[PDB]
Design an enzyme around this catalytic site. Sequence first.
Site, PDB file in Angstrom:
ATOM      1  N   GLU A 145       0.846  -1.208   0.000  1.00 28.81           N
ATOM      2  CA  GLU A 145       0.000   0.000   0.000  1.00 28.81           C
ATOM      3  C   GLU A 145       0.868   1.239   0.000  1.00 28.81           C
ATOM      4  OE1 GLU A 145      -3.601  -2.104   2.681  1.00 28.81           O
ATOM      5  OE2 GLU A 145      -2.389  -0.454   3.535  1.00 28.81           O
ATOM      6  N   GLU A 146       1.888   1.287   0.880  1.00 28.20           N
ATOM      7  CA  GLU A 146       2.625   2.546   1.143  1.00 28.20           C
ATOM      8  C   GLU A 146       3.833   2.738   0.221  1.00 28.20           C
ATOM      9  OE1 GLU A 146       1.325   3.037   5.884  1.00 28.20           O
ATOM     10  OE2 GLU A 146       3.506   3.123   5.325  1.00 28.20           O
TER      11      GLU A 146
ATOM     12  N   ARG B 141       4.098   7.267  21.604  1.00 34.44           N
ATOM     13  CA  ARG B 141       2.932   7.189  20.696  1.00 34.44           C
ATOM     14  C   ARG B 141       2.059   5.948  20.996  1.00 34.44           C
ATOM     15  NH1 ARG B 141       2.047  11.805  19.830  1.00 34.44           N
ATOM     16  NH2 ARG B 141       0.623  11.072  18.196  1.00 34.44           N
TER      17      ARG B 141
HETATM   18  O1  LIG Z   1       0.214   7.903   7.525  1.00 30.06           O
HETATM   19  P1  LIG Z   1       1.244   6.813   7.768  1.00 30.06           P
HETATM   20  O2  LIG Z   1       0.738   5.442   7.470  1.00 30.06           O
HETATM   21  O3  LIG Z   1       2.589   7.017   7.112  1.00 30.06           O
HETATM   22  O4  LIG Z   1       1.648   6.850   9.291  1.00 30.06           O
HETATM   23  C1  LIG Z   1       0.908   7.517  10.366  1.00 30.06           C
HETATM   24  C2  LIG Z   1       0.459   6.490  11.408  1.00 30.06           C
HETATM   25  O5  LIG Z   1      -0.324   5.472  10.787  1.00 30.06           O
HETATM   26  P2  LIG Z   1       0.147   3.976  10.813  1.00 30.06           P
HETATM   27  O6  LIG Z   1       1.407   3.779   9.933  1.00 30.06           O
HETATM   28  O7  LIG Z   1       0.357   3.516  12.231  1.00 30.06           O
HETATM   29  O8  LIG Z   1      -1.107   3.196  10.213  1.00 30.06           O
HETATM   30  P3  LIG Z   1      -1.731   2.915   8.738  1.00 30.06           P
HETATM   31  O9  LIG Z   1      -2.512   4.089   8.502  1.00 30.06           O
HETATM   32  O10 LIG Z   1      -2.364   1.501   8.931  1.00 30.06           O
HETATM   33  O11 LIG Z   1      -0.424   2.829   7.825  1.00 30.06           O
HETATM   34  C3  LIG Z   1      -0.372   7.252  12.421  1.00 30.06           C
HETATM   35  O12 LIG Z   1      -0.969   6.273  13.353  1.00 30.06           O
HETATM   36  P4  LIG Z   1      -2.576   6.381  13.850  1.00 30.06           P
HETATM   37  O13 LIG Z   1      -2.318   6.490  15.340  1.00 30.06           O
HETATM   38  O14 LIG Z   1      -3.142   4.912  13.712  1.00 30.06           O
HETATM   39  O15 LIG Z   1      -3.420   7.308  13.027  1.00 30.06           O
HETATM   40  C4  LIG Z   1       0.682   8.097  13.171  1.00 30.06           C
HETATM   41  O16 LIG Z   1       0.035   8.758  14.244  1.00 30.06           O
HETATM   42  P5  LIG Z   1       0.560   8.309  15.841  1.00 30.06           P
HETATM   43  O17 LIG Z   1       0.453   6.677  16.004  1.00 30.06           O
HETATM   44  O18 LIG Z   1      -0.433   9.139  16.600  1.00 30.06           O
HETATM   45  O19 LIG Z   1       2.056   8.596  16.132  1.00 30.06           O
HETATM   46  C5  LIG Z   1       1.249   9.189  12.186  1.00 30.06           C
HETATM   47  O20 LIG Z   1       0.157   9.919  11.699  1.00 30.06           O
HETATM   48  C6  LIG Z   1       1.879   8.479  10.976  1.00 30.06           C
HETATM   49  O21 LIG Z   1       2.317   9.486  10.019  1.00 30.06           O
HETATM   50  P6  LIG Z   1       3.828   9.497   9.507  1.00 30.06           P
HETATM   51  O22 LIG Z   1       4.697   8.619  10.338  1.00 30.06           O
HETATM   52  O23 LIG Z   1       4.193  11.043   9.493  1.00 30.06           O
HETATM   53  O24 LIG Z   1       3.721   9.080   8.011  1.00 30.06           O
HETATM   54  F   LIG Z   2      -2.610   2.065   6.267  1.00 27.81           F
HETATM   55 MG   LIG Z   3      -0.685   2.331   5.832  1.00 27.37          MG
HETATM   56 MG   LIG Z   4       1.482   3.549   7.892  1.00 24.57          MG
HETATM   57 MG   LIG Z   5      -3.307   0.582   7.332  1.00 26.79          MG
END
Ligand SMILES: O=P(O)(O)O[C@@H]1[C@@H](OP(=O)(O)OP(=O)(O)O)[C@H](OP(=O)(O)O)[C@@H](OP(=O)(O)O)[C@@H](O)[C@H]1OP(=O)(O)O
Ligand SMILES: [F-]
Ligand SMILES: [Mg+2]
Ligand SMILES: [Mg+2]
Ligand SMILES: [Mg+2]
Length: 135
Positions: free
Chosen positions: A62-63, A82
Amino acid sequence: QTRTYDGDGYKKRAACLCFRSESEEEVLLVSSSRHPDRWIVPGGGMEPEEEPSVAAVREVCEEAGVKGTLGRLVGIFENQERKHRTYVYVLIVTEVLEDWEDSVNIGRKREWFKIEDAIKVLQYHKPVQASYFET
Ligand SMILES: O=P(O)(O)O[C@@H]1[C@@H](OP(=O)(O)OP(=O)(O)O)[C@H](OP(=O)(O)O)[C@@H](OP(=O)(O)O)[C@@H](O)[C@H]1OP(=O)(O)O
Ligand SMILES: [F-]
Ligand SMILES: [Mg+2]
Ligand SMILES: [Mg+2]
Ligand SMILES: [Mg+2]
Ligand SMILES: [Cl-]
């Protein structure tokens, strides 16, 4: 999109160290979604009843828009600030896809880094992800 949690309330995540080859000298990082001038290790939330190795491979598709040969579990890494807990796997990249989900949806970028440079760019905002490479 349902987030999942360990018994201590930490969010469950999985990620891969996406290496260019079995020599594990170059790794693929992707741009931060919050701050696109920063780099992160691709990864994300485990879905309900989803195996960590399945979640890891799915999130890097996905990423990062890559597929490959799943390798070893490196370790399980907590981010105390976090409140999340990430299973980190080796993936040896064999397919590099164009126009992947996050490229199309949020203009996410990807780049190969020598291991020492990956550790350097992760250190300031993502020191736990820098630690993924310590082994
Ligand atoms: O958007 P992603 O997938 O790259 O990753 C984000 C996390 O998304 P994550 O990679 O964990 O999930 P997914 O969206 O499944 O990839 C999100 O986590 P969430 O808490 O679930 O919104 C976390 O927030 P935190 O956990 O509050 O520190 C940050 O937004 C983080 O943003 P980044 O590291 O700047 O790119
Ligand atoms: F995701
Ligand atoms: Mg993701
Ligand atoms: Mg992610
Ligand atoms: Mg995800
Ligand atoms: Cl390599």
